[PDB]
Design a protein around this motif. Structure first.
Motif, PDB file in Angstrom:
ATOM      1  N   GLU A  42       6.129  10.209   2.569  1.00  0.00           N
ATOM      2  CA  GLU A  42       4.856  10.684   2.542  1.00  0.00           C
ATOM      3  C   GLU A  42       4.009   9.746   3.169  1.00  0.00           C
ATOM      4  O   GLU A  42       2.963  10.153   3.982  1.00  0.00           O
ATOM      5  CB  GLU A  42       4.285  11.223   1.310  1.00  0.00           C
ATOM      6  CG  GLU A  42       5.083  12.517   0.722  1.00  0.00           C
ATOM      7  CD  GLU A  42       4.963  13.580   1.814  1.00  0.00           C
ATOM      8  OE1 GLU A  42       3.668  14.262   1.742  1.00  0.00           O
ATOM      9  OE2 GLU A  42       5.717  13.919   2.646  1.00  0.00           O
ATOM     10  N   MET A  43       4.166   8.392   2.899  1.00  0.00           N
ATOM     11  CA  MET A  43       3.476   7.472   3.455  1.00  0.00           C
ATOM     12  C   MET A  43       3.617   7.256   4.759  1.00  0.00           C
ATOM     13  O   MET A  43       2.500   7.101   5.750  1.00  0.00           O
ATOM     14  CB  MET A  43       3.505   6.085   2.694  1.00  0.00           C
ATOM     15  CG  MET A  43       3.629   5.702   1.125  1.00  0.00           C
ATOM     16  SD  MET A  43       1.457   6.441   0.861  1.00  0.00           S
ATOM     17  CE  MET A  43       0.820   5.193   1.667  1.00  0.00           C
ATOM     18  N   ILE A  44       4.945   6.928   5.116  1.00  0.00           N
ATOM     19  CA  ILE A  44       5.179   7.081   6.732  1.00  0.00           C
ATOM     20  C   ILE A  44       4.760   8.328   7.464  1.00  0.00           C
ATOM     21  O   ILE A  44       4.188   8.253   8.664  1.00  0.00           O
ATOM     22  CB  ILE A  44       6.749   7.088   6.627  1.00  0.00           C
ATOM     23  CG1 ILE A  44       7.376   5.645   6.124  1.00  0.00           C
ATOM     24  CG2 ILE A  44       7.072   7.373   8.251  1.00  0.00           C
ATOM     25  CD1 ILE A  44       8.703   5.727   6.236  1.00  0.00           C
ATOM     26  N   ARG A  45       4.827   9.583   6.794  1.00  0.00           N
ATOM     27  CA  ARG A  45       4.255  10.820   7.214  1.00  0.00           C
ATOM     28  C   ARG A  45       2.859  10.659   7.923  1.00  0.00           C
ATOM     29  O   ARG A  45       2.486  11.112   8.991  1.00  0.00           O
ATOM     30  CB  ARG A  45       4.414  11.665   6.109  1.00  0.00           C
ATOM     31  CG  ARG A  45       3.808  13.302   6.708  1.00  0.00           C
ATOM     32  CD  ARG A  45       3.886  14.204   5.289  1.00  0.00           C
ATOM     33  NE  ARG A  45       3.621  15.619   5.754  1.00  0.00           N
ATOM     34  CZ  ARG A  45       3.989  16.469   4.789  1.00  0.00           C
ATOM     35  NH1 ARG A  45       4.229  16.320   3.514  1.00  0.00           N
ATOM     36  NH2 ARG A  45       3.737  17.966   5.269  1.00  0.00           N
ATOM     37  N   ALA A  97      -2.776   3.536  13.800  1.00  0.00           N
ATOM     38  CA  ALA A  97      -2.211   2.129  14.470  1.00  0.00           C
ATOM     39  C   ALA A  97      -1.635   1.146  13.400  1.00  0.00           C
ATOM     40  O   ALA A  97      -2.215  -0.045  13.742  1.00  0.00           O
ATOM     41  CB  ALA A  97      -3.126   1.903  15.454  1.00  0.00           C
ATOM     42  N   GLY A  98      -0.759   1.293  12.700  1.00  0.00           N
ATOM     43  CA  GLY A  98      -0.454   0.382  11.429  1.00  0.00           C
ATOM     44  C   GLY A  98       1.007   0.399  11.204  1.00  0.00           C
ATOM     45  O   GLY A  98       1.616   1.405  11.246  1.00  0.00           O
ATOM     46  N   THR A  99       1.689  -0.555  11.370  1.00  0.00           N
ATOM     47  CA  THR A  99       3.233  -0.937  11.184  1.00  0.00           C
ATOM     48  C   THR A  99       3.701  -0.928   9.887  1.00  0.00           C
ATOM     49  O   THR A  99       3.178  -1.685   8.870  1.00  0.00           O
ATOM     50  CB  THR A  99       3.505  -2.227  11.905  1.00  0.00           C
ATOM     51  OG1 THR A  99       3.024  -2.298  13.217  1.00  0.00           O
ATOM     52  CG2 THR A  99       5.033  -2.434  11.809  1.00  0.00           C
ATOM     53  N   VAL A 100       4.520   0.355   9.405  1.00  0.00           N
ATOM     54  CA  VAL A 100       4.889   0.418   8.076  1.00  0.00           C
ATOM     55  C   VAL A 100       6.302  -0.223   7.808  1.00  0.00           C
ATOM     56  O   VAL A 100       7.317   0.191   8.434  1.00  0.00           O
ATOM     57  CB  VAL A 100       4.910   1.745   7.631  1.00  0.00           C
ATOM     58  CG1 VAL A 100       5.615   2.122   6.239  1.00  0.00           C
ATOM     59  CG2 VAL A 100       3.576   2.526   7.845  1.00  0.00           C
ATOM     60  N   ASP A 122      12.535  -1.796  -7.083  1.00  0.00           N
ATOM     61  CA  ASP A 122      10.974  -1.896  -6.953  1.00  0.00           C
ATOM     62  C   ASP A 122      10.875  -1.941  -5.211  1.00  0.00           C
ATOM     63  O   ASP A 122      11.467  -2.812  -4.655  1.00  0.00           O
ATOM     64  CB  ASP A 122      10.394  -3.279  -7.373  1.00  0.00           C
ATOM     65  CG  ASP A 122       8.910  -3.107  -7.064  1.00  0.00           C
ATOM     66  OD1 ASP A 122       8.226  -2.695  -7.922  1.00  0.00           O
ATOM     67  OD2 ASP A 122       8.758  -4.111  -6.095  1.00  0.00           O
ATOM     68  N   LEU A 123      10.236  -1.132  -4.631  1.00  0.00           N
ATOM     69  CA  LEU A 123      10.004  -1.000  -3.083  1.00  0.00           C
ATOM     70  C   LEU A 123       8.723  -1.344  -2.667  1.00  0.00           C
ATOM     71  O   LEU A 123       7.750  -0.640  -2.711  1.00  0.00           O
ATOM     72  CB  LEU A 123      10.217   0.631  -2.840  1.00  0.00           C
ATOM     73  CG  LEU A 123      10.054   1.012  -1.375  1.00  0.00           C
ATOM     74  CD1 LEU A 123      10.995   0.312  -0.618  1.00  0.00           C
ATOM     75  CD2 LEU A 123      10.040   2.589  -1.208  1.00  0.00           C
ATOM     76  N   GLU A 124       8.645  -2.507  -2.083  1.00  0.00           N
ATOM     77  CA  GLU A 124       7.577  -3.074  -1.706  1.00  0.00           C
ATOM     78  C   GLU A 124       7.306  -2.851   0.002  1.00  0.00           C
ATOM     79  O   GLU A 124       7.940  -3.241   0.778  1.00  0.00           O
ATOM     80  CB  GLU A 124       7.663  -4.646  -1.645  1.00  0.00           C
ATOM     81  CG  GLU A 124       8.007  -5.317  -3.203  1.00  0.00           C
ATOM     82  CD  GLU A 124       8.012  -6.755  -3.195  1.00  0.00           C
ATOM     83  OE1 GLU A 124       7.036  -7.443  -3.046  1.00  0.00           O
ATOM     84  OE2 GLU A 124       9.286  -7.100  -3.553  1.00  0.00           O
ATOM     85  N   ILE A 125       6.355  -2.221  -0.051  1.00  0.00           N
ATOM     86  CA  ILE A 125       5.959  -1.212   1.273  1.00  0.00           C
ATOM     87  C   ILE A 125       4.637  -1.919   1.870  1.00  0.00           C
ATOM     88  O   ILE A 125       3.561  -2.212   1.229  1.00  0.00           O
ATOM     89  CB  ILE A 125       5.515   0.030   1.121  1.00  0.00           C
ATOM     90  CG1 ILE A 125       6.787   0.882   0.531  1.00  0.00           C
ATOM     91  CG2 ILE A 125       5.346   0.643   2.488  1.00  0.00           C
ATOM     92  CD1 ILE A 125       6.332   2.161   0.334  1.00  0.00           C
ATOM     93  N   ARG A 126       4.963  -2.901   2.951  1.00  0.00           N
ATOM     94  CA  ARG A 126       3.691  -3.911   3.616  1.00  0.00           C
ATOM     95  C   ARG A 126       3.467  -3.147   4.700  1.00  0.00           C
ATOM     96  O   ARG A 126       4.134  -2.926   5.720  1.00  0.00           O
ATOM     97  CB  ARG A 126       4.122  -4.986   3.937  1.00  0.00           C
ATOM     98  CG  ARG A 126       3.310  -5.948   4.777  1.00  0.00           C
ATOM     99  CD  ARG A 126       3.315  -7.484   4.905  1.00  0.00           C
ATOM    100  NE  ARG A 126       2.960  -7.931   3.361  1.00  0.00           N
ATOM    101  CZ  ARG A 126       2.981  -9.313   3.104  1.00  0.00           C
ATOM    102  NH1 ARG A 126       3.298  -9.956   3.936  1.00  0.00           N
ATOM    103  NH2 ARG A 126       2.423  -9.460   2.090  1.00  0.00           N
ATOM    104  N   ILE A 127       2.189  -2.345   4.750  1.00  0.00           N
ATOM    105  CA  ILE A 127       1.593  -1.281   6.013  1.00  0.00           C
ATOM    106  C   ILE A 127       0.621  -2.680   6.602  1.00  0.00           C
ATOM    107  O   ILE A 127      -0.341  -2.867   6.173  1.00  0.00           O
ATOM    108  CB  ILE A 127       0.903  -0.342   5.394  1.00  0.00           C
ATOM    109  CG1 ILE A 127       1.600   0.572   4.735  1.00  0.00           C
ATOM    110  CG2 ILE A 127       0.284   0.296   6.885  1.00  0.00           C
ATOM    111  CD1 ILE A 127       1.019   1.713   4.436  1.00  0.00           C
ATOM    112  N   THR A 128       1.147  -2.971   7.881  1.00  0.00           N
ATOM    113  CA  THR A 128       0.376  -4.154   8.546  1.00  0.00           C
ATOM    114  C   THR A 128      -0.677  -3.364   9.505  1.00  0.00           C
ATOM    115  O   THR A 128      -0.211  -2.723  10.556  1.00  0.00           O
ATOM    116  CB  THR A 128       1.277  -4.968   9.398  1.00  0.00           C
ATOM    117  OG1 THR A 128       2.159  -5.574   8.500  1.00  0.00           O
ATOM    118  CG2 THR A 128       0.394  -6.122  10.246  1.00  0.00           C
ATOM    119  N   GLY A 129      -2.247  -3.960   9.512  1.00  0.00           N
ATOM    120  CA  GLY A 129      -2.847  -3.219  10.315  1.00  0.00           C
ATOM    121  C   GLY A 129      -3.723  -1.853   9.735  1.00  0.00           C
ATOM    122  O   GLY A 129      -3.508  -0.847  10.560  1.00  0.00           O
TER     123      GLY A 129
END
Length: 85
Positions: A21-24, A30-33, A41-48
């Motif tokens: 859903e986050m990726i969706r 314009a942000g790199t997931v 534990d799933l560490e999701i770093r969204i850059t930008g």
């Protein structure tokens, strides 16, 4: 400005659906997931990400953690600068 959204849950599907859903939505921005799954534990770093959208993403992270009853911890990476005055 980056954002580390860490999803921690009991079943894998909780991670699967929440992440997807986050990726969706994230594809529309314009942000790199990026993400790393370490143990449980799933560490999701969204850059930008802009501060306006930061609200929407952070709040849906809460929403996901609610429907899945799982744990969510999100660290907002603040753009910084050692000022002179």
């Amino acid at each position: 400005m980056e954002m580390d959204i860490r999803f921690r849950g009991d079943d894998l599907e909780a991670f699967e659906k929440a992440l997807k859903e986050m990726i969706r939505q994230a594809r529309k921005f314009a942000g790199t997931v990026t993400y790393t799954l370490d143990g449980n534990d799933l560490e999701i770093r969204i850059t930008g990400v802009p501060e306006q959208v930061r609200k929407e993403l952070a709040k849906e992270a809460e929403r996901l953690a609610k429907e899945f009853n799982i744990t969510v911890t999100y660290t907002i990476r603040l753009e910084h600068h050692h000022h002179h005055h």
